[PDB]
Amino acid sequence: GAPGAPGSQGAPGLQGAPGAPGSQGAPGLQGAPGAPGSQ
Amino acid sequence: GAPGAPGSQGAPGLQGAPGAPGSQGAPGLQGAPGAPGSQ
Amino acid sequence: APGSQGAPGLQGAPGAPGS
Amino acid sequence: APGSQGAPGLQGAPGAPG
Amino acid sequence: APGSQGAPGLQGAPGAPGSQGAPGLQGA
Amino acid sequence: APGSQGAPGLQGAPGAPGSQGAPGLQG
Amino acid sequence: APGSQGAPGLQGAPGA
Amino acid sequence: APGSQGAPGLQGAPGA
Amino acid sequence: GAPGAPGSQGAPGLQGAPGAPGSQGAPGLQGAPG
Amino acid sequence: GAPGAPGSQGAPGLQGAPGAPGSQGAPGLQGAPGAP
Amino acid sequence: APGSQGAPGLQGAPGAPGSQG
Amino acid sequence: APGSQGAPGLQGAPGAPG
Amino acid sequence: APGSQGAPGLQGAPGAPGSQGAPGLQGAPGAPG
Amino acid sequence: APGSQGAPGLQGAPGAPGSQGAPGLQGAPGAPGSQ
Amino acid sequence: APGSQGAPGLQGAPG
Amino acid sequence: APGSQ
């Protein structure tokens, strides 16, 4: 009258869940007055 | 008969690596081009 | 992954310099 | 994907005084 | 709830300055 | 569960639909 | 920004 | 959106 | 075997016009200078 | 017994039908506004 | 599949003009 | 991840009088 | 169906049409003047 | 169904990248010159 | 593609 | 540019 021992292992990686944000990095400002054509 | 040994999964919550590192985005040029001399 | 960018052509005609 | 729809936007600037 | 798991619907609420403009340019 | 599956997220995309210098040649 | 194509500014307009 | 590299992309200050 | 071919259905693919396109409008066509 | 190709087959699933007009890119832009 | 990529408005050198104007 | 893709693009027309 | 299982097909040759012609980008400057 | 299907490949043409059509070559129309 | 962005005119400042 | 400097 004995059942088994279903000690289900864990997940070696499991829900690591990397953010996967995706690179938005946007250095996008050289807008300092670039010598405007007003001379 | 006797108990068992571990092992199971199917899909233990797939997550996905991070997206990427900050790009250069849309680097600007300047406020206005043409000349820096006095108008 | 959904990676969705090669080169957005990196500048749409930067500008028309006044001179 | 697209880089800010012509990233700068109206690059020559909208003079449009009036 | 067996439910599911999903990343946020979207980000915050940005957007306004940085496109283009020159209220004061005439270039005549 | 019907929980951590997005939802609250706003645009989070700054359209930045205006950049008016103003001081420049004439105007 | 992408999405506002066509003539989001004066473009052809030399000025005002 | 159309997701395009739009913007007016032109010049207008010294244009007129 | 083959009780009712459980889920032995057809596999339609990518209908419509796969190949996500997009409009593209750059700085407008330049005028004909004098 | 022995399912006849068990599971299911509803392949098409989601669909984007990306049948946008081939022009996609600015076809010919805007007729040259000739200026003085 | 490997995809989703962008390169939208991949201008390259649309105008690349000097002091033409 | 198609290996990104052909990305031949950067600044357009920096023309005008400048 | 032991036939095959690999998620093999990742898109294909025609792929992005990417015609990549550039009929004209900057050639004859429309008679700038 | 041992080896049921003949491993349908990339359902036709593999080789992701496209860039086919070459609408033109270069040189936006007009009149050449340093103007 | 290390060192591979010059699309418009990069490294072409003739001024 | 042929000028502006």
Contact between chains at N26 and M25 (C-beta distance less than 8 A): yes
Contact between chains at K17 and L17 (C-beta distance less than 8 A): no
- The type of residue at G5 is Q
Nearest residue in N to J27, CA atom = N23
Number of H helices, E strands in chain B: 0, 0
SS3 content of chain H, % helix, strand, coil (to 5): 0, 5, 95
Q: How far is CA I30 from CA G15, J36, K18, in A?
A: 14, 13, 15
N7/B33 Cα distance (integer angstroms): 60
Contacts of O8 in chain C (CB under 8 A): 10-11, 14
Cβ atoms of H4 and I25 closer than 8 Å: yes
D7/B29 Cα distance (integer angstroms): 11
Contacts of I27 in chain L (CB under 8 A): 12-13
Contact between chains at L16 and B34 (C-beta distance less than 8 A): yes
I26/L12 Cα distance (integer angstroms): 10
Residue in E19, E20, E27 nearest the CB of G15:
E27
G1-16 exposure pattern, b = at least 16 Cβ within 10 A, e = fewer: bbbbbbbbbbbbbbbb
How many cross-chain Cβ pairs, C to D, lie less than 8 Å apart? Answer: 34
K10 at H interface, C-beta within 8 A: yes
- Pull the structure tokens for residue J35: 């200026």
Contacts of D13 in chain E (CB under 8 A): 20-22, 25
**Which residues, listed in sequence order, are joined to residue F5 by a DSSP beta bridge?**
E6
- Return the half-sphere exposure (C-beta side, CA atoms, 13 A cut-off) of residue C18: 32
Q: What is the largest CA-CA distance in chain C?
A: 46
Local structure of residue D11 (DSSP, 8 states): T
Contact between chains at D13 and F21 (C-beta distance less than 8 A): yes
What is the distance of C-alpha N15 from the center of its chain? 9
Resolution (A): 9.8
C2 at H interface, C-beta within 8 A: no
Nearest to H7 by CA among A16, C8, D17: C8
Cβ atoms of E18 and F16 closer than 8 Å: yes
Query: CA J23, J27, J29, J31 torsion: positive or negative?
Result: negative
C7 at B interface, C-beta within 8 A: no
- The type of residue at J30 is Q
Measured from the Cβ of residue H6, the count of other Cβ atoms closer than 10 Å reads 30
Burial class (CB in 10 A: 0-12, 13-18, 19+), O14: exposed
E9/E1 Cα distance (integer angstroms): 20
Cβ atoms of N29 and M28 closer than 8 Å: yes
- Pull the structure tokens for residue G9: 């500014």
Contact between chains at C12 and K9 (C-beta distance less than 8 A): yes
Cβ atoms of G2 and D1 closer than 8 Å: yes
- The type of residue at J6 is P
Measured from the Cβ of residue N1, the count of other Cβ atoms closer than 10 Å reads 12
**Which residues, listed in sequence order, are joined to residue E4 by a DSSP beta bridge?**
F2
- Return the half-sphere exposure (C-beta side, CA atoms, 13 A cut-off) of residue N10: 13
Nearest to L17 by CA among I18, B34, G3, K16: B34
Local structure of residue I27 (DSSP, 8 states): S
P3 at C interface, C-beta within 8 A: yes
Q: Is E6 helix (H, G, I), strand (E, B) or coil?
A: strand
Query: CA A28, A30, A31, A37 torsion: positive or negative?
Result: negative
